[PDB]
Amino acid sequence: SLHYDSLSKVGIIKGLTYNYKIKGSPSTKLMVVKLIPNIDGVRNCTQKQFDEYKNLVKNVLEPVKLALNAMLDNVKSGNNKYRFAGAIMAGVALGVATAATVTAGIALHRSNENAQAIANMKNAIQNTNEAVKQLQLANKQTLAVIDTIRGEINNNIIPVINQLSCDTIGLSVGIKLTQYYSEILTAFGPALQNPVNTRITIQAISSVFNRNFDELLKIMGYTSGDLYEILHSGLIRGNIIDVDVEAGYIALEIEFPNLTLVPNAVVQELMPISYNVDGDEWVTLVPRFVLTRTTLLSNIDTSRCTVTESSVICDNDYALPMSYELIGCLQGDTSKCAREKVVSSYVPRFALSDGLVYANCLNTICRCMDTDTPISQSLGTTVSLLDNKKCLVYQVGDILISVGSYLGEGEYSADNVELGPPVVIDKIDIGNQLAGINQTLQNAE
Amino acid sequence: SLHYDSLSKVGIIKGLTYNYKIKGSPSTKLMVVKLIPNIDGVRNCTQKQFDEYKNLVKNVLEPVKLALNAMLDNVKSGNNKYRFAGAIMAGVALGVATAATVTAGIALHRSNENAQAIANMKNAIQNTNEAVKQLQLANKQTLAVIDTIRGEINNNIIPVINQLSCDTIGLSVGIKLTQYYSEILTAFGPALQNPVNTRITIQAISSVFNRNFDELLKIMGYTSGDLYEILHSGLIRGNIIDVDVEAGYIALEIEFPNLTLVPNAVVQELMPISYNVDGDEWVTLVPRFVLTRTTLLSNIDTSRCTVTESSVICDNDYALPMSYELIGCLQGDTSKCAREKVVSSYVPRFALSDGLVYANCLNTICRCMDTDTPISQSLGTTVSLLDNKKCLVYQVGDILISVGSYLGEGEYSADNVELGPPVVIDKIDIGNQLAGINQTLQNAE
Amino acid sequence: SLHYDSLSKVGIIKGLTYNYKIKGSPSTKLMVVKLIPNIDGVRNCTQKQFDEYKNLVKNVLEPVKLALNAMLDNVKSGNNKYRFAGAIMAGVALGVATAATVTAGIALHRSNENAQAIANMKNAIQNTNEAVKQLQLANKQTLAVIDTIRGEINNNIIPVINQLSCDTIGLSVGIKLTQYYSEILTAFGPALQNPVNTRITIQAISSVFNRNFDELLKIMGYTSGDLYEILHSGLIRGNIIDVDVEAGYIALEIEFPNLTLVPNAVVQELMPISYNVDGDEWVTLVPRFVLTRTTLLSNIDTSRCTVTESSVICDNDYALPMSYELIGCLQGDTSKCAREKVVSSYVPRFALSDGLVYANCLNTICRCMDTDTPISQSLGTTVSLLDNKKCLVYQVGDILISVGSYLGEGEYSADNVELGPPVVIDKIDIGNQLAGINQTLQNAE
Ligand SMILES: *[C@@H]1O[C@H](CO)[C@@H](O[C@@H]2O[C@H](CO)[C@@H](O[C@@H]3O[C@H](CO)[C@@H](O)[C@H](O)[C@@H]3O)[C@H](O)[C@H]2NC(C)=O)[C@H](O)[C@H]1NC(C)=O
Ligand SMILES: *[C@@H]1O[C@H](CO)[C@@H](O[C@@H]2O[C@H](CO)[C@@H](O[C@@H]3O[C@H](CO)[C@@H](O)[C@H](O)[C@@H]3O)[C@H](O)[C@H]2NC(C)=O)[C@H](O)[C@H]1NC(C)=O
Ligand SMILES: *[C@@H]1O[C@H](CO)[C@@H](O[C@@H]2O[C@H](CO)[C@@H](O[C@@H]3O[C@H](CO)[C@@H](O)[C@H](O)[C@@H]3O)[C@H](O)[C@H]2NC(C)=O)[C@H](O)[C@H]1NC(C)=O
Ligand SMILES: *[C@@H]1O[C@H](CO)[C@@H](O)[C@H](O)[C@H]1NC(C)=O
Ligand SMILES: *[C@@H]1O[C@H](CO)[C@@H](O)[C@H](O)[C@H]1NC(C)=O
Ligand SMILES: *[C@@H]1O[C@H](CO)[C@@H](O)[C@H](O)[C@H]1NC(C)=O
């Protein structure tokens, strides 16, 4: 295991502990986003602006419909006696594709039944007359229809239509139309270029609906405060499954993935702090998080994942290999841990763990309050430990802290420690270092 | 060239292929953004809030007008006999500048005739009375005037002004004024510090106009769906060219670049996959994209560029040098390619290219469906090729795929392959590795 | 010092100079954000939607109130004779925490008097009836109350309530409620998970108030155009200090930090340019900025700081150590500077400094205008210097520039220069380089 005793002596302290979770088997819901609203009540005046808008919508949606049909043409159902019944990808026709694209092509074909079901409700979809509405399909799944422009009209024009001239109606609706179209190009643009591979988060989808993703979740059937783990990590995503160029709408399938708890896997945080070396201040280099899975160590690359209050959530397993030298450190060999000189005025100089306080008392104030006496650590010792045995309250920096009883054998000593090699890391001077060391090899004879 | 036979044996597969495009000679259009609206119809009530707002505008715009004049003072036209007729930078007065800043200072002076043309229309600019409007200059270029607050007032106050008390008018317009000013500080803030160097995308400009960049493009005369290559890569950019502190407006010149297709240059994607090594799973390290230009290889740094469906588009040529060892890989010497151990549960285990499937059948399921038979690859072989000759349909993983005819001499074998060295990369343990290897040199005698 | 003479010979030119500033002792202001508005005038129709909303607010705020109480339970005031009077952290109860979290826990307890003062005004806070309002506390500090939903209602519903049916009122307010709730989850989500450690910028707070941060600054008492140094660098931040689950409001304390000018510390920019080497084009690798503090060199990592027109502003001192080899360069030893081959078509080929122009005239046009004659630099020389002595105006590239008098002894020569080692840097091929060099060590015997 981590053997935290040997780590504490070089300013690495046992931090928080988190569960590891991964995207599991997903549930799905159907949604339709309308590009062309139902113009009822303002049809008399907006005719000139609306006819321009319909052409813009048709021109934008035609390439998408072509790309979708071109993908469906490459997938055929397993009607033959083939025992692994499913769908077959025509690899000779698709030409070049990653496993992701091939899987997405199959998933698009698998999603086509929902597209047909939605298409049979086109007459109802064109008649919603409300900012957002829920409909029932022949498959008895519910369909959420988004109608943002109808919301803008129902709230800003229809209530005051008596005070607005017909010219004003034309101009105002024209502006609202162009505004909405710019929203769609901002949010859906990538998917409109490549609809098979691209996915969109529910937040980004909701940017086309005044960022009101909560209303979308509510109408699909989920409470936005309950889904926090899935919602905030960006795992609630959707993709295009069909498009209609005459009705002007995009059919999206939204995915609500469950989260599988990874068995016997734990993410451990490490808290680095400064330590004394012959009066100088040094810090040990180790990643902020390390993943222990069935006793095996690994590096998480946590920036691509979400650190919740109690778990780390990832789109897929992101564990990376770790160099033998670093594993030495994480297994108690203090002599292999790279260390770096402190230059910044401010660097963390103490930490609390299981009620014990570890501190670099040669570079920060440390005083026993029960005896109003300063605590001195010999210049050989790296870090001091504050214990319940000597004092109940200690001053550290400008704060007072109360601490617990030491759990090891005898008493803690930090002088007989095998320090590691000094290192400096930046892209710029790594090059200089590499070149300089290679000159020795170039000169070897 | 890439010699993809030798690459496939270590799990690098021929991906998609793209044109390389660069920002060319630009067209330009003129725009004015007004900070101060025309207050007609609400002039009676808003006076106290409006007089504060004019002071805030003047205080913001004065330093910009100073910085602009201080730059124009350093550029003088070539009225003397100088044979390379143009404009002269007073380098002793400018003091310290990059080539970019010197060029932008010259371009500001070159733009100043448009500033004079706009300034002679100031009387009309102060009268526009519509949310966005087009004017004709004396030079018979058109000017787009943006007037966002007049849009807010025309839509939300004037239609209901009978129902609002005069105090309510004052408060509501004071809020709209402060809101708009906070938009301007968000979007233009950098350019208001440094107007010569700074550039702003048309999207970011449109954040001052309810994100409606489509309406801006329409009025400048271009259709937002037609410009996608230039628009979405963020190459439609503007900069400040003049400011008026009493009328309270910013004059912008917006740049619509052409794209030049780079001659005899191609960007090639490389798809990595896992492969077997004696029962372990390994991946080869190569960049996702490489650029071949007149048979020269180079590294693109593609994150700074846009990958469209059919081209890679860049603000400038970004080709970087490449290490001899990696060129070795990309010219078929398998022995120099660094390789990394797979630790994640998920890494891509097959890919499709020109209708062939390459797969790592010791680490994923592979079966011939025409004979309902599992496919075995001998433990020396890195990857298996799936061919038309044996089967028309293969299962790979949980998908079925139909595949094309092999094109080489004889039949593919992937056992006699010269593997490269094992590597682990992160900044931290690059540090540890560098120090540890250098101890051999430090000890040599 | 930097010894710019030796640097210019390898295409490194003296750039701009900036002050170094750090976050100092902060002032503070109090703010309350209301989740539940006062429903006056629309209470008849919205009852069904409002009762749902109150439950959502309570469910969201209860965990926050629990986490806050759980933190306050660990801090006790120094009522005993302890001489360093203040507050004591119960480290045995807190368990594991970084110095930052411990300090924030103490700061939360120190902030609790303001929480009590605000809580005694709860009856007034629930009655604001205006989009934003200022109140006076018993401590005579002013409290800013944000009431966004009341603003939306006062501007879009109450002025036209005669034209809206009761059903329409219910639906429209329901949409506004869900929209606002989604804004709150977007902006405050992180703080609602971990309220002790998390901080929010005034801009992000204002996202819950139609991005109108200017109005917030105005009501708290500061002018948004005057605070630019603190405001734009993102240093105006607030954190949660109390929450009420019945009134449904979040109490925030906002921090306005002063900026301390760091004594005898200067940030110096370095402008790299190409230079000739035996007809090839090369660039020297050095960081864009370097920090000289009391004659000591250091690396700034400027991406984490704000580069204003005249100063660099940072949240804390971020100076990092620098390798001896790079310090050699920055101290005049030209032989240690890593250099890289130019491949991109465009790289900066000239620069202006103190009125002198440095240019790579073997790779760019250079002509004297007083004599209409090209300037030739011998293939041994790296960079040419343009001086007042020979010409008053020089053409460089496609621009004309006037230059000053050389200040050194004799005349400038760039041939007898000790060039450094060639280097190539990327994460991918650093691995290949490291592996290849280590094979020599593996083979040494
Ligand atoms: C292997 O790693 C060590 C790390 O300790 C490298 O040490 C470097 O050695 C040089 C020369 O001994 C140091 O140069 C400095 O020179 C000045 C002027 O003489 C002197 O005052 C300094 O005290 C120091 O000796 C350099 O600072 C040092 N660098 C580091 C980061 O420690 C060593 O170069 C590497 N081995 C080889 C063969 O390069
Ligand atoms: C330490 O650095 C030097 C450069 O200063 C490295 O030299 C490199 O050596 C290789 C192998 O000779 C060169 O690659 C190619 O070699 C073939 C056969 O000699 C030649 O025909 C090609 O034209 C090409 O030169 C390479 O160019 C050269 N330079 C660089 C920058 O890589 C040397 O490899 C390093 N030390 C060790 C032990 O590797
Ligand atoms: C140059 O590169 C080689 C790899 O090609 C480095 O080899 C690595 O060296 C360490 C120390 O000998 C090995 O660790 C030990 O491995 C054995 C067998 O797995 C294990 O029983 C020990 O407990 C310990 O972990 C490491 O495995 C080995 N790497 C490989 C892939 O075999 C070598 O260290 C480098 N040379 C220098 C001078 O740094
Ligand atoms: C539009 O025309 C219809 C015709 O049936 C009429 O009922 C309606 O009042 C008209 N509306 C406006 C705003 O002119
Ligand atoms: C403002 O004054 C004009 C007369 O100058 C009047 O016609 C208009 O109705 C007034 N508006 C208000 C809101 O008092
Ligand atoms: C709501 O009820 C009050 C009476 O308490 C009445 O004065 C008010 O006009 C009503 N509003 C609506 C919209 O029905």
Residue numbers in the entry:
A (entry chain B), B (entry chain A), C (entry chain C): 22 to 466
Study text:
The HNV F protein is a trimeric type I fusion protein that is initially expressed as an F precursor (F0), consisting of three domains (DI, DII and DIII), a C-terminal stem, a transmembrane domain and a cytoplasmic tail. We found that LayV F and MojV F both adopt a “tree-like” prefusion F structure similar to that of NiV, despite only sharing ~40% sequence conservation at the amino acid level. We show that despite sequence divergence from NiV, the F proteins adopt an overall similar structure but are antigenically distinct as they do not react to known antibodies or sera.
In August 2022, a novel henipavirus (HNV) named Langya virus (LayV) was isolated from patients with severe pneumonic disease in China. Based on the sequence of LayV, published in August 2022, we expressed the F ectodomain residues 1-478 without any heterologous stabilizing mutations. Through iterative particle picking, 2D classification and 3D refinements, we obtained a final structure of LayV F at 3.37 Å. In our analysis, we observed two particle populations that either had the stem domain displayed or not. Several rounds of heterogenous refinements and ab initio reconstructions using cryoSPARC were required to remove particles where the stem was not resolved. This yielded a final map including both the globular head domain and stem and resembled the “tree-like” conformation seen before for other HNV F proteins. LayV F DI is central to the monomer and is flanked by DII and DIII, the latter of which contains the fusion peptide (FP). Comparison of the trimers reveals a shift in the major outward facing DIII helix of LayV F relative to NiV, mediated by an adjacent loop region of a neighbouring protomer, which adopts an altered conformation in both MojV and LayV. The alternative cleavage site conformation for LayV is likely due to the presence of a bulkier hydrophobic leucine residue in position 413 in the adjacent DII (serine in the equivalent site in MojV), which would otherwise clash with the conserved and cleavage-site proximal tyrosine 102 (Y107 in MojV). In fact, our cryo-EM structure coupled with mass spectrometry analysis revealed that only positions N65 and N459 are glycosylated on LayV F, demonstrating that this glycoprotein is significantly less glycosylated in comparison to NiV.
